[PDB]
Structures are given as C-alpha cells and as structure tokens.
Amino acid sequence: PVPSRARVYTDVNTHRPSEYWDYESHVVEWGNQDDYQLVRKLGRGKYSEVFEAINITNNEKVVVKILKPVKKKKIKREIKILENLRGGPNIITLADIVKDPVSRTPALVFEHVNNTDFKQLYQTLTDYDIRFYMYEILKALDYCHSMGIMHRDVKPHNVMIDHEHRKLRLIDWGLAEFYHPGQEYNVRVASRYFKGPELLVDYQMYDYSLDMWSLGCMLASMIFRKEPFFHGHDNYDQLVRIAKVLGTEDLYDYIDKYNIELDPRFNDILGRHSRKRWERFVHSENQHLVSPEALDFLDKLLRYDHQSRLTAREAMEHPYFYTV
Ligand SMILES: Cc1ccccc1-c1ccc(CN)cc1Cl
Numbered sequence: 001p002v003p004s005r006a007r008v009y010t011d012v013n014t015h016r017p018s019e020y021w022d023y024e025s026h027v028v029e030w031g032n033q034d035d036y037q038l039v040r041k042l043g044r045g046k047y048s049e050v051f052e053a054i055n056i057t058n059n060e061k062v063v064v065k066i067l068k069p070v071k072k073k074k075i076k077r078e079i080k081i082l083e084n085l086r087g088g089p090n091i092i093t094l095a096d097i098v099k100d101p102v103s104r105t106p107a108l109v110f111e112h113v114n115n116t117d118f119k120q121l122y123q124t125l126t127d128y129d130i131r132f133y134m135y136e137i138l139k140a141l142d143y144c145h146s147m148g149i150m151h152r153d154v155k156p157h158n159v160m161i162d163h164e165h166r167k168l169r170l171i172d173w174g175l176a177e178f179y180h181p182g183q184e185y186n187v188r189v190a191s192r193y194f195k196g197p198e199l200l201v202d203y204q205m206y207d208y209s210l211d212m213w214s215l216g217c218m219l220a221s222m223i224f225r226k227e228p229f230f231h232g233h234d235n236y237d238q239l240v241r242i243a244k245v246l247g248t249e250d251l252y253d254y255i256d257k258y259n260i261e262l263d264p265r266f267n268d269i270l271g272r273h274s275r276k277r278w279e280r281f282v283h284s285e286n287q288h289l290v291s292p293e294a295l296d297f298l299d300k301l302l303r304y305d306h307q308s309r310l311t312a313r314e315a316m317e318h319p320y321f322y323t324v
C-alpha cells in the first residue's frame with residue numbers, strides 16, 4: 001500500500017520527548033481505594049464496569065470505572081493518554097487511579113457527569129443545539145489531535161452530555177493511540193457503525209482523520225434522525241452500507257490511490273452503487289434540523305479519502321458554526 005500521513009499535527013509526537021508518548025515506560029501510582037465508596041452501578045462497558053461513587057474525603061460524587069485487566073499495556077496506554085489530556089477542553093478528567101487490594105483489580109476514577117439520555121437528546125435537540133454540541137466535540141478533537149492523540153472510538157455512547165448545564169465530555173480513551181507519521185496501526189478499532197473506510201479496507205496508515213469520519217457518522221444520524229446512519233451487520237457489510245450512499249466509483253478510486261488490496265470476502269457483496277444526494281435523506285420528521293450549511297459540512301466529513309476530510313480545525317471554521 002501507498003504511504004500516507006496526517007495533513008495536521010503531523011510531527012507533534014516526533015518533536016516531543018519519549019516520556020510523553022512512551023506509555024509502556026509510564027509509572028502508574030495508585031491512590032487510596034478507601035477514599036471512595038461505591039454508590040450504584042451506572043453502565044457496563046465491554047472492558048469495564050462503571051459505578052457512581054462518593055469521595056468520602058471531600059463529599060464529591062465521582063465515577064469509578066472498574067477494569068477487568070485482560071491486557072496490562074492497554075491500561076497503561078489509557079492512563080498515559082488521560083494524564084496527557086487532563087484539563088483539555090471537554091476531555092473527561094481522570095481524578096485518580098485505584099486498586100482493589102484483595103482481587104488486584106485496577107479502577108479509574110473520573111469526574112462525575114450527569115448524562116442526558118441519548119434517546120432524550122435525540123427527541124429534544126434543536127438545530128442550534130446540534131451545532132453547539134458538534135462544536136464542543138470539535139474543541140475536544142482539535143485538542144487531542146493537537147496533543148498527537150487519535151481517539152479511535154468516537155460515537156454517541158462516548159460523548160457525555162449534561163444538557164441542563166450545556167456541558168459535554170468526550171470519554172472512553174481505552175482505544176486511543178499516539179499518532180506517529182508512517183506508523184501502521186491495528187484496524188480493529190472504533191465501533192462498527194463509526195469505522196472509517198480506511199479500517200474496513202484494512203489500510204493501516206491512518207490518522208486523526210479517522211475521528212472526523214466517526215464525527216460525520218454522528219452528525220448524519222442526528223440531523224437525519226437515522227440511528228445509526230450506516231447500519232452494517234458485520235465489518236464487511238459496513239463498507240457496503242457506506243458504498244450505498246457514497247457510491248462504488250469513489251471507493252475504487254480511493255483503493256487505487258493507496259494501492260489497497262480488497263479482501264476476497266467483498267467480491268460477492270460489494271456490487272455497484274451510484275453516489276447519492278444528501279438532500280434525499282430529508283423528510284418531514286428531520287427537515288427542521290437540516291440546512292444547506294449542515295449538508296455542505298456533512299459532505300466535507302463523509303469522504304472515503306481520509307486526506308480529503310476536513311480536519312477538526314477546518315471544521316470549526318465551517319459556516320455551519322457561524323451561529324455558535
Ligand atoms: C472494588 C474495587 C475494584 C477495583 C479497584 C478498587 C475497588 C475498591 C475497593 C474498595 C473500596 C473501598 N470502599 C473502593 C473501591 Cl473503588
């Protein structure tokens with residue numbers, strides 16, 4: 001395959017000391033698990049169990065993410081990234097790291113966010129609200145990309161919103177990675193509906209632009225009231241669902257540009273599809289959230305060619321946000 005590199009923040013990690021990005025050498029230091037009393041179960045993650053807790057030293061509510069330690073290196077990576085990004089705009093704050101003495105189980109302690117229901121948000125958000133929150137996510141992405149980090153798991157479940165306080169936090173940094181130009185990354189990242197075409201065609205030299213694809217998927221779902229927007233039933237079918245909207249000609253152009261070899265499993269499912277018009281998704285139930293600026297913005301995120309997508313900084317300058 002033809003090599004590629006990010007159009008922005010390309011060399012941020014190259015020009016930083018090894019300590020910043022070498023998470024395997026990061027020294028983790030435990031806090032006191034006895035400072036925290038678990039209150040109730042919140043949600044159960046693929047790699048974790050989440051609880052609401054009280055920090056008994058200051059009477060503050062926190063969230064405790066108990067991690068089943070399947071892989072030690074992965075935990076160190078999440079911790080290092082959270083420490084690096086701590087205090088960034090709209091980045092979840094890691095408050096502490098604790099261990100359960102008897103079971104030797106690690107847990108991450110975060111600032112508590114009173115999360116508005118996804119279904120509730122879908123029903124009541126206004127056109128202005130969608131622009132406001134999309135801009136808040138962009139602040140988080142432009143910051144983490146500027147810090148040489150790709151989130152790689154951008155999706156609604158990883159975006160906590162306290163609608164009452166208009167507060168947004170990008171969470172679950174468990175799949176996040178440091179961007180090093182020329183590096184070949186594992187394509188088995190992100191959640192199916194949000195996986196960029198680069199991951200689906202097994203193009204390993206991807207970058208921050210993967211997060212911009214995921215963000216486009218979110219925007220498309222909310223403005224069109226179609227969740228998820230690209231409803232794949234498996235990783236191969238996910239590429240067909242995208243191909244049904246963006247057409248198959250630009251898919252081959254993208255494959256040819258980077259000399260990508262398509263897996264044989266695509267041969268009998270991919271087919272031939274025309275490029276569709278974003279206006280075809282407009283209906284009576286979603287027209288109050290769609291505008292020419294929204295469609296132009298979406299068209300600039302949802303592109304096969306990862307290099308052609310708006311960067312988070314370019315996205316922040318789009319007319320869709322002139323009202324925020
Ligand atoms: C249950 C657990 C799992 C992983 C890390 C820490 C803990 C833990 C153990 C004891 C206490 C004290 N009430 C608190 C926690 Cl979070």
Ligand SMILES: Cc1ccccc1-c1ccc(CN)cc1Cl
Pocket residue numbers: 116117118121122129130133134137155156157158159160161218219221222
């Ligand atoms: C998908 C989307 C797009 C634009 C604005 C808000 C949202 C949104 C909806 C629900 C949730 C669930 N915690 C998160 C977000 Cl960012």
